[PDB]
Amino acid sequence: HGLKEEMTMKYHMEGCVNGHKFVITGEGIGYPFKGKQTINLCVIEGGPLPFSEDILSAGFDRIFTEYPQDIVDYFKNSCPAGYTWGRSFLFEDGAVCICNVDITVSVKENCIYHKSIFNGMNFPADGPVMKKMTTNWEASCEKIMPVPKQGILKGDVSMYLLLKDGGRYRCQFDTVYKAKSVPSKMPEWHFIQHKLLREDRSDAKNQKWQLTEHAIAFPSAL
Amino acid sequence: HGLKEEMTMKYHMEGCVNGHKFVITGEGIGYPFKGKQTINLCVIEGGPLPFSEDILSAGFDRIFTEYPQDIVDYFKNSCPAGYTWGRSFLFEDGAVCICNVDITVSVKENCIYHKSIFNGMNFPADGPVMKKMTTNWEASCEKIMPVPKQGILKGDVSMYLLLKDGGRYRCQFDTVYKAKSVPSKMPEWHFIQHKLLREDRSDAKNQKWQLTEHAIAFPSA
Amino acid sequence: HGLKEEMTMKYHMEGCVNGHKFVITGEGIGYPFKGKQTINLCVIEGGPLPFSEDILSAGFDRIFTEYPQDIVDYFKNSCPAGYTWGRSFLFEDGAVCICNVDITVSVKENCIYHKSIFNGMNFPADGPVMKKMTTNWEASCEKIMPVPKQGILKGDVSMYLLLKDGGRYRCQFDTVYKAKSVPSKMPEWHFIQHKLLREDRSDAKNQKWQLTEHAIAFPSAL
Amino acid sequence: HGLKEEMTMKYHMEGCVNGHKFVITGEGIGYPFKGKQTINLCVIEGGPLPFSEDILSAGFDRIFTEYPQDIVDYFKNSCPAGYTWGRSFLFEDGAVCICNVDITVSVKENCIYHKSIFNGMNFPADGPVMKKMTTNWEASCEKIMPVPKQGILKGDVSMYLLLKDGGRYRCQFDTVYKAKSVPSKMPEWHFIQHKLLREDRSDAKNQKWQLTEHAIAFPSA
């Protein structure tokens, strides 16, 4: 698809969570074919963040998903124009989020740009988010399905955000993946298992952390 | 409240619904104390909108609410600084919207400026919105409750967008009302009844519509 | 409708909340035309209840609703066969409830019988319900609407359960009202404001409390 | 676990969906260790059901789950006492169901008895269920997580009931798995993948259908 085994990517997130506007920029290396990525994020505006940085995580690339040969890779096939995605975040405490990502490709640079807009609200002031009581997301299995006569995908995943107290914090992810160009081939409903971790790196001069994700496409084990 | 019986208001809305970007601007005259208002909207970008306009309606002011003396008017009391609002639209069919509005009032201009940011997704292609089969919102009764120790308000209302077939289409509105400065006083939980309508007014050069809203504050009967 | 100004009623609730089976019986007096009712409840089985008794409250009669003349009283018109209702309870903490009520009339006795089945689950062990941290429901306004070509009603109300800490506890009430006989006249969408209070009366020999409700039908004040 | 590679099971179901009461009884053969099972159902009351049978399917055993040695099988470990389950069905169109099952095993009979209580409402009259336009459930992947200090399990899965038009119909399954006696050990969060199908087998004297399910436990890949 014009993809390298190893890739670099850029991040620019524009957001407002519970009235708090902020600005995050990033950089990363990834293995499209490995379904792995490691990114570095920085709050260049609105920091330090008043909420849990874990809610932004997934709003930062399905391209970085190791697909089987028997399965159509909507995302990679997306090369070279890229694609866009929108996602609803339904937290168990009533908080609501919408995220919009625009994936574009710096072909010769072999760099994938990500431009996102994140909007979240109704995050309880006592919640783990407002109280920054989170730690990491739990491993998951997302259902990916094609939209008949549409050329788009639908991602369905029930997320669990692990808290310091040891508890879980539930969130429903509902995504729509839209390729920038009409897709010749469409995949069949499948699954995407993921592993996303955050490791802070804030100094005291800057709020930063590093993200990391691993994902493999799979079919129903039946 | 430094407000006038009759006034004016200006609107500027930016949004991307189901990936469709659009810009809307409006003008209006209102009666803060009557809780009445009529507004004229004109899509000045992304028109014509590929979805129903009905979804954007409420996304265009709690200042325009007839409040009883017995009840604290957090909104009017919001002067001079003004206030802001955040809202989540939970449509029965899976669609998700978020709207944030920044409210500011010009004394010298006797106008109320509204700057909204409407975002929505997961609007089923064959849905009433995507297939523009909506007519009007059914009259509501919203619940306004104070957030102890937060200085903010919470609005809760179950909306119904009336369809052409005469079928209702459900949507849960969850609002957060926050004044720009620390509130001197807080009201008690109460209700707000509203009636909002839409009259199309598009031509061929531009897509336009008129909005109207009447709201009255109330207590438990 | 054969209704008296003053009425007596009987209660028999069969339930299981979070695995806890219980049995409540009751008796009450009401004013159909006043839209008022006062009932006395007793846990004859499964007591003392492990959960907050406030969740059962509304599962105990729209007949007791003061209607305007301009508005059709589906419920009273229901005389003399009575009617049935089913309701879903969606609590903010994930707990789920379904309630089914069967309203029958002891015509000459002028007594209204109520036979209910209550099923609730996913009530967090730390919740106000499990922790019995509730006190009373807050006043509400329910939307009542007709079902085109069905002869049934739909009740929509967002409930708030007041806690001891002073906080609210949200619950979505979604009802279906089915008259025992084909209705000649149907009402137009309207509203029903309610006030429901609980006043314990458990001795130490028996778990009991008294309920009380006031309700008036209204049209959109527009 | 006192269980047998191959076994039998008996079913008795009582329910009132949308006010329609019904009684169902079934017989089956299963492979606890294979996580496989086939069951034969017969409406012996309230038939024919006015709604889709597909809704009752999952309402008919986590014992039948192929579990890796590396993972704790809370269900099989549930022997001898057995276990119970509670589940909420959150259908996209507003329908609401609750199902509770009491699980008991006869050593001497090598059969597993299932006593369910299915309740459901708000099934849109023109819905796929009410208009019986459903075919089968799409293969799933459920999330099984332990409840610390409770001795219970929590199952989470987003279901899709396939329609005749080939359209999917959404339903959220939220389960609570509770053993009859204090568990010696607890498993770690893991997944359960399932494949469940329905083959009609009604005649004219009785309404019958066959159910089949294959489930395998798994960890994060």
Chains that touch A (3 or more CB pairs under 8 A): B, C, D
Best residue of C98, C100, C172, C174 to probe chain D, by most D CBs closer than 10 Å: C98
> How many Å apart are CA B195 and CA B66, to the nearest integer?
13
A15 sits in which H/E element: strand A7-17
What are the tokens at B31? 């009666």
Q: How far apart are CA C118 and CA C46, in angstroms?
A: 13
CB-nearest partner of C222 from B158, B189, B195: B195
Asked if C19 and D178 come within 8 Å (Cβ–Cβ), the reply is yes
Q: Is A94 close to C94, i.e. CB distance below 8 A? A: no
Euclidean distance between CA atoms C16 and C19, whole angstroms: 6
Nearest-Cα distance to chain D for B199, in Å, is: 30
Of C38, C21, C20, which is closest to residue C29 (Cα–Cα)? C38
Q: Return the half-sphere exposure (C-beta side, CA atoms, 13 A cut-off) of residue D121.
A: 22
In sign, the C-alpha dihedral spanning A164, A168, A172, A173 is positive
User: Interface partners of B (3+ CB pairs, < 8 Å)?
Assistant: A, C, D
| Tokens linked to D72 | 């704790």
- Whether B221 sits inside 8 A of C222 (CB atoms) is no
**What residues of chain C have any CB closer than 8 angstroms to a CB in chain A?**
92, 94, 170
Secondary structure letter of residue A184 according to DSSP: S
Q: Which two tokens stand for residue A149?
A: 């006569």
Hey, which residues does D11 pair with through a beta bridge?
A: D26, D114
Judge: C94–A92 Cβ closer than 8 Å, yes or no. yes
Q: A14 is written with which tokens?
A: 């524009």
Range(s) of the domain holding residue A195:
1-222
**Chain D: which residues have CB within 8 Å of chain A?**
138-139, 141, 143, 145, 148, 156, 158, 166, 168, 189, 191, 193-195, 214, 216, 218, 220-221
Contact (CB, 8 A) for B26 and B11: yes
- Pairs of residues, one from chain A and one from chain D, whose beta carbons lie less than 8 Å apart: 39
Residues D45, D46, D51, CA angle at the centre, nearest 5°?
Answer: 135
Indicate the SS3 state at residue D55.
helix
Contact A28, A11 (CB under 8 A): yes
CA distance B103 to B83: 5
CB pairs under 8 A between A and C: 4
- Does the beta-carbon distance from D88 to C100 stay under 8 Å? no
Task: Classify residue C32 by burial, with Cβ atoms within 10 Å: 0-12, 13-18, 19+.
Answer: buried
Q: How many CA atoms lie within 13 A of B139 on its CB side?
A: 17
Domain count, chain A: 1
CA distance A13 to A56: 9
Q: Are strands A36-45 and A20-31 parallel, antiparallel or unpaired?
A: antiparallel
Strand D111-121 to D7-17 pairing:
parallel
What CATH code is carried by the domain that includes residue D105?
A: 2.40.155.10
Residue entry with tokens 């490691």: A38
Non-local CB neighbours of C204 within 8 Å, separated by 6+ positions: none
Q: What are the structure tokens assigned to A105, written together?
A: 């490709």
What is the DSSP annotation of B65-84?
A: -B--TTS--TTGGGTTT-EE
